[PDB]
């Protein structure tokens, strides 16, 4: 109602076309080994969009 | 037909097949005698080669491909009346 | 990093390869002896030099 | 199904 | 407005031109993704060609389609004439164990020759071989004109 932008945007496939370049992609698996979220983000690089 | 050869071949047929009648036909010269004079002066040319004798029967292809000789005063005053002289081709 | 160049000797048509994919014998521009069949994508003719990172591998068929 | 030349090479 | 309604055919060695208005266009693109045409040299079926104008027509269409077809050419074209409205559809066909079975495919429409000229189309001035008379007394009644 502010008429400033379209907010929920149906976009083109794929997500990789709509992803950043320096990029790590993870799927939460119920079988894959457990990690720590804080330790994982801190061991991540500086300019990386998880 | 075969009656076309047994009847229609004439001295007039071969005479209109002659060259200056074809020049006068394509209106190269206004008159057939001036066509003959142009033939004598060699101001014409018949395909690859120019010509000088009126006593010439022309094959249909060379009838399509006959004209004036290049850098001739007659074709030059043609292009002068048409005001389209192109001295690059020494026209 | 060392990068090698190799001039085309002979184009190789009529083989069974994917569309756009090109199969070409080249020779080492450095050592005129060695001839390797590699693959080139773009539009190419004979006797032009090409760029190469890996030399020992030769580009095989791609159906 | 392979290609001739390739088959000759592997044989 | 994107609606095909006119088709002219010229014969290039100084040949005649046939000028048609085509209206009732039904396209395979419009209907379905039915696949592709067989593209074999088709068989031809001419119907209701009576006058010598129709003879010139069937000559022109016979000659525009490719010469010397296979006896077992499995696609057939029709030339269905009625009420001065020739109409055409592509037809592939097979014979059954007993009879024949066809499939209509390709396009589907009605055209009508409103002109035939002797010269080529780039003339626009050569002598017309046949002209349609729209503004006459017997116009909605006279056949083959």
């Amino acid at each position: 109602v502010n008429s400033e932008e379209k907010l929920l945007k149906v976009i083109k496939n794929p997500i990789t076309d709509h992803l950043p370049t320096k990029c790590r992609k993870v799927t939460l698996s119920f079988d894959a080994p457990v990690i720590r979220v804080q330790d994982y983000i801190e061991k991540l690089d500086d300019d990386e969009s998880i | 037909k075969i009656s076309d050869l047994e009847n229609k071949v004439t001295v007039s047929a071969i005479c209109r097949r002659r060259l200056p009648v074809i020049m006068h036909r394509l209106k190269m010269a206004e008159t057939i005698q001036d066509a003959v004079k142009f033939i004598e002066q060699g101001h014409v040319r018949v395909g690859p080669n120019l010509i000088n004798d009126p006593a010439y029967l022309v094959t249909r292809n060379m009838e399509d491909y006959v004209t004036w000789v290049d850098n001739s005063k007659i074709k030059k005053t043609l292009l002068r009346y048409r005001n389209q002289i192109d001295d690059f081709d020494f026209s | 990093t060392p990068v090698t160049l190799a001039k085309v000797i002979k184009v190789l048509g009529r083989t069974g390869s994917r569309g756009g994919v090109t199969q070409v014998r080249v020779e080492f521009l450095e050592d005129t002896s060695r001839t390797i069949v590699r693959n080139v994508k773009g539009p190419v003719r004979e006797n032009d030099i090409l760029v190469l990172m890996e030399s020992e591998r030769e580009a095989r068929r791609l159906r | 199904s392979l290609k001739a030349g390739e088959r000759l090479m592997e044989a | 407005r994107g609606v095909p309604t006119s088709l002219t055919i010229s014969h290039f060695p100084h040949g005649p031109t046939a000028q048609f208005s085509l209206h009732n266009v039904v396209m395979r693109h419009d209907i379905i993704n039915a696949g592709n045409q067989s593209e074999v040299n088709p068989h031809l079926i001419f119907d209701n060609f009576t006058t010598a104008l129709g003879k010139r027509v069937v000559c022109i269409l016979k000659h525009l389609f490719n010469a010397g077809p296979k006896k077992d050419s499995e696609r057939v074209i029709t030339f269905a004439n009625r009420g001065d409205f020739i109409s055409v559809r592509q037809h592939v066909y097979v014979r059954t164990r007993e009879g024949v079975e066809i499939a209509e495919v390709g396009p589907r429409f009605e055209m009508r020759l409103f002109e035939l000229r002797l010269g080529t189309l780039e003339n626009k001035d050569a002598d017309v071989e046949w002209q349609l008379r729209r503004f006459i007394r017997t116009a909605n009644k006279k056949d083959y004109l």
Binding site: - | - | G20, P43, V44, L62 | - | -
Partner: protein, 213 residues
């Protein structure tokens, strides 16, 4: 030592012919501004695909280069760059605008780095000319990326279109103009600065190629 005498009268023209014109008759330069020597290819396997040896003033030669298979290689490279930059629906076939923006870009590059803008063009082209690319093997369904090489013609065309598109998107919705942003991208790819979209693109292509080689 030895000399030839060839001019014998001071050439005077009743139409006033400028000094830059009477120097351009001595040497053709691009926009009468940049000479055609000292612009040589820094790398083999791309020479004779790059054609720069023939002098010109403006890249508007109407020579038909669209018929053979290598007339694009015989074409002057700046003309191909202009044909590339005039690629939008709002930019289809605007060659005078193209030539003017090229002149602007060349002036700006010669201002920033005073060596030679056309040599910066040649070097950035040779720099961003890619080296390896991965096709998509269908694999009966297992469509994976498999690295092979690339013709230097295709390297040329892809580099040209890559810098073209990069400058286009860079000054697409931006206060900076196409000429200055193409100057910046050209200096960037001449540096191999890796802040240029073209260099980054070629880098990630050859990265994927070295990966699935």
């Amino acid at each position: 030592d030895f000399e030839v005498v060839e001019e014998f009268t001071p050439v005077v023209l009743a139409t006033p012919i400028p000094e830059e014109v009477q120097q351009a008759q001595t040497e053709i330069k691009l926009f009468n501004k940049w000479s055609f020597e000292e612009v040589e290819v820094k790398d083999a396997s791309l020479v004779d695909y790059v054609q720069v040896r023939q002098p010109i003033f403006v890249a508007h030669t109407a020579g038909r280069y669209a018929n053979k298979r290598f007339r694009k290689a015989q074409c002057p490279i700046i003309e191909r760059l202009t044909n590339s930059l005039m690629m939008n629906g709002r930019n289809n076939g605007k060659k005078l605008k193209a030539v003017r923006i090229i002149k602007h870009t060349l002036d700006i590059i010669n201002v920033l780095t005073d060596q030679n803008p056309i040599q910066v063009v040649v070097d950035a082209i040779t720099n961003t000319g890619p080296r390896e690319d991965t096709t998509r093997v269908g694999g009966g369904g297992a469509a994976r990326r498999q690295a092979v090489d690339v013709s230097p013609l295709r390297r040329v065309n892809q580099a040209i279109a890559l810098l073209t598109i990069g400058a286009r998107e860079a000054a697409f919705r931006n206060i900076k103009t196409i000429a200055e942003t193409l100057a910046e991208e050209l200096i960037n790819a001449a540096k191999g600065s890796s802040t240029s979209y073209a260099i980054k693109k070629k880098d990630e292509l050859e990265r994927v190629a070295k990966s699935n080689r």
